Amino acid sequence: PESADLRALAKHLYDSYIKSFPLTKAKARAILTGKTKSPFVIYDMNSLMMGEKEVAIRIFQGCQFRSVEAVQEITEYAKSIPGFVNLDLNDQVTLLKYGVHEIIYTMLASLMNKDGVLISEGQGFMTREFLKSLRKPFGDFMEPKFEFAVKFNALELDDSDLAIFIAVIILSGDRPGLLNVKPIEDIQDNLLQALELQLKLNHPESSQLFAKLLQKMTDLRQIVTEHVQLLQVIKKTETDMSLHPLLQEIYKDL
């Protein structure tokens, strides 16, 4: 291992992260803290109608479009991680299949404070209470994300940090179905090393930021798991629930 390469990798990943995800933590936080006329607050059924077939199904059918596009962008990110393009195309699929939603919820955290979540690329703000007030099991989709986002946002990671942490999540050599995990671990071990260095310089006063961040990686796996389970309860009930084929492609056998 060489510090120059590890730092080259950090900077490489950051520039590629900038060039791949139009929505960064820096833009989301600038909106959330008012330093950026202003997002439209959605806190009830009526101002949801003013914000612009049941309401709960409708609040979430629109999000699919951004999910699909996040799958597109995460994929253009994974193609920039040194070594990924040469892995067996089958492992490339599996790494995106399991990685994509862990990274989405990592990025969704930037959009969240304890009180709510930015919507429509920050043109709206939908309150947590309102999401909590929805019916069926619909009003339990977002509350686990808020509890995570509050704890995760407390790490004070920035877009430099996130680029590498997200790359580490993609290069997870323990997902079901990888063909040979050996080259995946060599990439990730090295990514983990850039992270440790990255966090040690960017945050010299957060003693064990590295350990606390590794433990959030497992939190992200449980969020996806519960989320996938809630989807199963809906598919048994809501006839009005359809899913984009890319998302349906990802959720099957997950």
């Binding site: 799958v71 994929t75 699929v93 299949k97 890319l246 492609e249 990802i250």
Partner: peptide, 11 residues
């Protein structure tokens, strides 16, 4: 394989 959209998104 059976993820054909993702397969296509990669090349």
């Amino acid at each position: 394989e059976r993820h054909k959209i993702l397969h296509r998104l990669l090349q």
